[PDB]
Amino acid sequence: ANLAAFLVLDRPEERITGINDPRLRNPSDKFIYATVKQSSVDIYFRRQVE
Amino acid sequence: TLDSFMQPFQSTLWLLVGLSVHVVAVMLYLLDRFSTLSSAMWFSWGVLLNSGIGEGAPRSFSARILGMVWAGFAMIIVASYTANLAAFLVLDRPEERITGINDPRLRNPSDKFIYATVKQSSVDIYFRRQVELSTMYRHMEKHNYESAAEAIQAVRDNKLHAFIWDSAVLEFEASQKCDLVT
Amino acid sequence: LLWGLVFNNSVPVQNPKGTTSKIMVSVWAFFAVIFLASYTANLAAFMIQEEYVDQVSGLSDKKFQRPNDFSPPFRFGTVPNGSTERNIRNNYAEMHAYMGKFNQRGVDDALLSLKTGKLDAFIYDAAVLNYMAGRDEGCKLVTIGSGKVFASTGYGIAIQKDSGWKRQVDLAILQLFGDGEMEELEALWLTGICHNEKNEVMSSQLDIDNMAGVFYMLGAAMALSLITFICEHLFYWQ
Amino acid sequence: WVMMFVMLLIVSAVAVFVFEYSFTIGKAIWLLWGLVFNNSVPVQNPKGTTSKIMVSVWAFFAVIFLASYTANLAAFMIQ
Amino acid sequence: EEAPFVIVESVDPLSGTCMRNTVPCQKRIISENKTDEEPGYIKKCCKGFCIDILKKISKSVKFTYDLYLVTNGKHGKKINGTWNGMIGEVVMKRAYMAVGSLTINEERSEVVDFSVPFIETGISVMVSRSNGTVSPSAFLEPFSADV
Amino acid sequence: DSRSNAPATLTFENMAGVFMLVAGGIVAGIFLIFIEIAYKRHK
Amino acid sequence: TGELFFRSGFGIGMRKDSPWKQQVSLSILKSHENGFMEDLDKTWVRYQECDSRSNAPATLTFENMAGVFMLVAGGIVAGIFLIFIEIAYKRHK
Amino acid sequence: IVTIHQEPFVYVKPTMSDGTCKEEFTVNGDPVKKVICTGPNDTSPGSPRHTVPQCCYGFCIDLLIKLARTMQFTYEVHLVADGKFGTQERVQNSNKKEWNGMMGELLSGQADMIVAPLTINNERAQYIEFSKPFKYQGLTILVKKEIPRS
Ligand SMILES: *[C@@H]1O[C@H](CO)[C@@H](O[C@@H]2O[C@H](CO)[C@@H](O)[C@H](O)[C@H]2NC(C)=O)[C@H](O)[C@H]1NC(C)=O
Ligand SMILES: N[C@@H](CCC(=O)O)C(=O)O
């Protein structure tokens, strides 16, 4: 019975949930995310005030 | 938990394994003619039931390897029997348990789901006041009750599907009656 | 003797005499005990991660193109007078001809026919089918694959030809994507309940299709045993 | 557990009655206990023909007994 | 009318008009062909995803409108070189714009003008989830031939 | 009590599936006992 | 990880005064209907390689035998030593 | 035609010493159709500013070939100088506002068509024209993943 539990139970994972994840919404110097300069992806973020 | 015999195995599977033990026993009888028909009856079953009944070992070299594979067949089906059963005990229906006030069954109410509250209380003030809950307020207005003893009773039977009330009162009811949950 | 222990000591044997032989048997028993425990435990794990597979690969499946040379031939259809019928007609003439006797008259009627077994497959618009999948009573209805689209297109607004409102209208539409109102609108109206991420609820009864391998192995073992017996008898004759 | 031990006693008495028609009384319970916890204990089989069918049925019971116990015990650990 | 995008129901019996967060659509009724009557119309209430899109869009390109439900045809079909449904209504200049679940394709794009799409769609196949699993050789999955 | 997994401990309900079979087998053998003892002298 | 947001697709850019802009859109719509666009996905996109999933039930490989088969293999080399001791003890006592 | 380097849609490889494109086959043995491009080499025009011929192929390249055959036109292709998709910026303290990247290549008369994975949005739609979409997508996040236990 223990061997069976060990073979199917996995450690918890963070797995960022998307654009509303607390890490991205409240950023810190320990977590870094970026995109490509002068892209449509840049226009999207720079234009919504929230 | 269903019936122990029928839950992990169909009745046709028992027949197939029920007949194959005689086929093995008949196969050993062919080796006796070419080069004991009661002793070997037992041996084939005894291996399946892993019991020490009987002491009849195969004689022919080819008969020896036939029962050599037969021992492995019993191990496979028994191992799958225990394995399948455990999977059945762990896995449960995901079900639907009304994630919250944002559940689509509440935001877009059909006629197959009815929820209400108590008339003239502070829950009525909450829904009536703020304009993006108008659809929800209209649905509850024709189903609201007079007291909470009545709405709680109407959930025990299937006349009502959801009741919205204070958490302090509702958490007490869920810990004293076992059909109910929050 | 020493092959009997590995398979749960099923067969009867006769014990040896040497003390070192007894030690060898005792140390082999541990190996066999651990070996079998490991086998069952893994077997249970495989089953608790069983994943389902789609019966049909897509629109070009064998059952769709040549349904006749199959058992109780596959039943599928759509509601006519739409874009789906127009596309199948121009790309699959014989499939369109075969579909003529399974025509539906509504989405709810098609779902009811599918639930009761009167229909085996339904082909319709991708946007309305994904909505009905997540709103079903239970999660009995699914779309093949993880949600697959053929001949990708979209919903638009039809305007009078050569009008001046089109530039304003589509500029206003692109503006809603930039603000993000589309996500709010799809959360408010298009949210669902059921999840299609390979739930894999449970198997049952361990039907014959599962024991086919072990039965075939038993048959092959019997065949090789009888062949070897015949060969040994012939050799002993000479 | 007692609901199955009573059946151990019943089957032992039935087998002793069958043997009437070197099988003592204590050896009956000893052999019948052996099958419940896997065939690890040496025993001696009763030559009685119907007793053989009875002990085969008991072995079929014991196989299901042990397998369900392992599946459930495993289940607690997962949850 | 399409179930998730355009939902239509009748006006409040108490007041005889449409509820909040909805829009009025007028529908036409045709009696028996043996004898018919002067214009007969029924007022309904229309709400949904496309209705919300039409409401926001209308307030910023600044126009007013009136809604009505089609009677002949559902979406559009070319029979003997003639169109019916919403497409046919737009062709005959009876309507200016059509709003709903209309798919953009090459055949229709030669007779009307489409705007950029606001949702993606296509063709899908729906089947009932067969109970059980698949396991032809599951018993051989554990371990490997080497051991 | 709470929890969602709710691992149900097995109880006496499983007896009817199995415990009756061995009980039925006890009375199914005595019927063959009378035939078997007669068959010793019948041939 | 996560869900999709800002759903805009890929288009072909031309100037507002072009004699080609109307024909390009019709050709793209026609290509989606007849399956030419699905052919391009198979050739360049959906050929794929190493697969998905995270649970990963895994077949046990040879690594377990190292910690198991060594004892029985080590028992063999440790058995002949006890063989001499046992047989000599019969002669000695 | 102006194109940008994006592996799933556009591949850029150096030409052979002869001056042509190396032959290559798919999994089914049919030839891969390539085209001769011309653009800056090394990193950027920041220091080695000079164009050299190269070979291009991919999802977008063979869609342009299909369009040309049906629409009966002949084309020459090249890579964007600065390697940017295009945004609107301001230059040297002036009231004017001008586009860079691939958007500015088309508006300045250096190009006639853009055949690349260019995203349709409100801001670009006020200066140029977009066709119906040939690919429907969204935005996502790419992260790393670790190893399980043993
Ligand atoms: C598809 O369109 C056809 C018309 O081509 C419809 O057939 C007509 O249906 C009406 C309504 O019952 C009848 O009064 C006509 O006599 C029918 N005409 C013919 C030629 O059959 C058909 O009902 C439509 N089907 C759907 C699902 O909309
Ligand atoms: N939305 C489709 C109707 C559904 C279908 O026919 O597939 C149309 O616009 O015609």
Side-chain angles (χ1 to χ4, degrees), chain G residues 16-29:
Chain G
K16 292 181 181 180
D17 56 318
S18 289
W20 309 99
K21 67 183 181 67
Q22 184 178 2
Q23 257 182 292
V24 171
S25 291
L26 281 185
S27 299
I28 283 184
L29 280 175

Side-chain angles (χ1 to χ4, degrees), chain C residues 79-81 85 104-106, chain E residues 74 77 79 84:
Chain C
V79 54
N81 298 342
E85 170 167 80
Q104 310 306 311
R105 57 177 218 270
Chain E
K74 295 190 176 67
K77 187 172 170 64
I79 308 147
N84 52 355

Side-chain angles (χ1 to χ4, degrees), chain B residues 1 4-5 8-26 28 30-31 35-54 56-58 60-92 94 96-111 113-182:
Chain B
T1 79
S4 72
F5 293 157
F9 274 114
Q10 184 57 258
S11 295
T12 61
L13 277 296
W14 300 102
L15 304 178
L16 290 196
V17 72
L19 61 89
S20 43
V21 55
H22 307 71
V23 187
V24 181
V26 165
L28 273 296
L30 268 72
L31 276 297
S35 184
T36 327
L37 254 294
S38 180
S39 76
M41 229 341 157
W42 282 131
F43 171 107
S44 330
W45 271 91
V47 176
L48 183 63
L49 300 153
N50 73 328
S51 167
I53 301 299
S60 169
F61 167 87
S62 67
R64 185 181 304 279
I65 192 166
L66 190 140
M68 183 177 176
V69 189
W70 176 242
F73 177 77
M75 183 278 288
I76 289 299
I77 62 170
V78 169
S80 57
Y81 176 61
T82 318
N84 193 33
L85 196 186
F88 155 101
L89 297 169
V90 169
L91 275 298
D92 276 322
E96 304 88 4
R97 271 264 181 99
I98 313 299
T99 56
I101 199 180
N102 282 282
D103 194 74
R105 266 164 294 208
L106 303 191
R107 313 302 293 218
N108 294 120
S110 62
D111 197 51
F113 204 75
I114 79 218
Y115 54 96
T117 184
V118 179
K119 276 192 279 186
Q120 280 136 44
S121 66
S122 70
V123 188
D124 291 331
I125 290 168
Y126 187 67
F127 286 92
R128 177 155 34 200
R129 198 202 40 257
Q130 100 204 224
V131 261
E132 119 258 24
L133 294 170
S134 335
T135 275
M136 308 189 39
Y137 176 59
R138 268 202 288 282
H139 182 101
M140 294 182 286
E141 190 276 331
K142 45 191 172 64
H143 296 286
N144 281 347
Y145 284 69
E146 297 278 337
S147 69
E150 283 174 46
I152 293 161
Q153 183 81 47
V155 167
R156 265 191 147 192
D157 49 357
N158 299 80
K159 319 183 156 201
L160 182 70
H161 297 104
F163 180 41
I164 309 179
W165 196 234
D166 312 329
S167 60
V169 177
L170 288 189
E171 303 184 345
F172 176 80
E173 294 289 347
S175 73
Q176 308 268 296
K177 304 172 170 20
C178 295
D179 6 1
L180 307 182
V181 70
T182 68

Side-chain angles (χ1 to χ4, degrees), chain E residues 1-29 31 35 39-58 60-140 142-145 147:
Chain E
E1 205 200 338
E2 188 81 85
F5 297 99
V6 173
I7 311 149
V8 1
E9 65 246 312
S10 36
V11 305
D12 192 4
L14 183 63
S15 71
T17 175
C18 277
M19 311 273 198
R20 209 183 285 257
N21 291 350
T22 73
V23 165
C25 24
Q26 303 292 311
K27 173 142 104 178
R28 194 177 73 183
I29 180 60
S31 66
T35 175
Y41 277 86
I42 297 89
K43 188 172 89 172
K44 297 289 184 72
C45 307
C46 280
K47 60 155 173 203
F49 184 85
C50 284
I51 312 293
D52 288 28
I53 283 183
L54 169 69
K55 286 199 230 137
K56 296 251 181 39
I57 272 243
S58 164
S60 71
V61 16
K62 287 177 310 268
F63 65 85
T64 63
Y65 58 90
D66 56 74
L67 262 174
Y68 76 92
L69 298 156
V70 73
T71 53
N72 179 61
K74 295 190 176 67
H75 285 107
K77 187 172 170 64
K78 192 174 196 173
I79 308 147
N80 292 326
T82 317
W83 288 86
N84 52 355
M86 317 205 267
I87 301 290
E89 288 279 319
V90 180
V91 171
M92 291 304 294
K93 311 207 180 199
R94 272 174 288 233
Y96 204 66
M97 258 153 87
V99 174
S101 73
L102 254 177
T103 71
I104 314 176
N105 58 28
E106 186 202 9
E107 188 188 40
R108 295 177 180 163
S109 298
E110 291 169 358
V111 123
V112 290
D113 273 24
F114 279 100
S115 75
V116 318
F118 49 81
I119 204 177
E120 87 101 23
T121 189
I123 288 157
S124 286
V125 186
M126 174 163 261
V127 303
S128 67
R129 182 179 292 172
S130 63
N131 45 0
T133 60
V134 286
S135 295
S137 65
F139 83 110
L140 289 155
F143 288 161
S144 304
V147 303

Side-chain angles (χ1 to χ4, degrees), chain C residues 131-136 138-175:
Chain C
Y131 173 75
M132 307 296 273
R135 290 289 175 111
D136 192 30
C139 304
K140 294 181 176 67
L141 300 173
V142 293
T143 56
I144 73 168
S146 69
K148 186 73 171 71
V149 179
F150 318 102
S152 302
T153 183
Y155 290 162
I157 290 161
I159 313 159
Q160 203 154 302
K161 187 172 276 292
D162 303 319
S163 170
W165 290 101
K166 186 181 77 172
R167 168 151 164 92
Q168 302 202 245
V169 165
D170 63 358
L171 276 181
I173 296 188
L174 289 170
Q175 179 83 257

Side-chain angles (χ1 to χ4, degrees), chain H residues 5-33:
Chain H
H5 178 55
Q6 276 271 324
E7 271 193 357
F9 303 93
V10 185
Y11 290 97
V12 188
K13 302 295 180 181
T15 56
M16 289 185 328
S17 309
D18 194 337
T20 186
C21 295
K22 174 185 54 178
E23 294 284 326
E24 182 186 333
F25 293 96
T26 65
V27 306
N28 290 318
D30 47 356
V32 168
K33 39 178 72 70

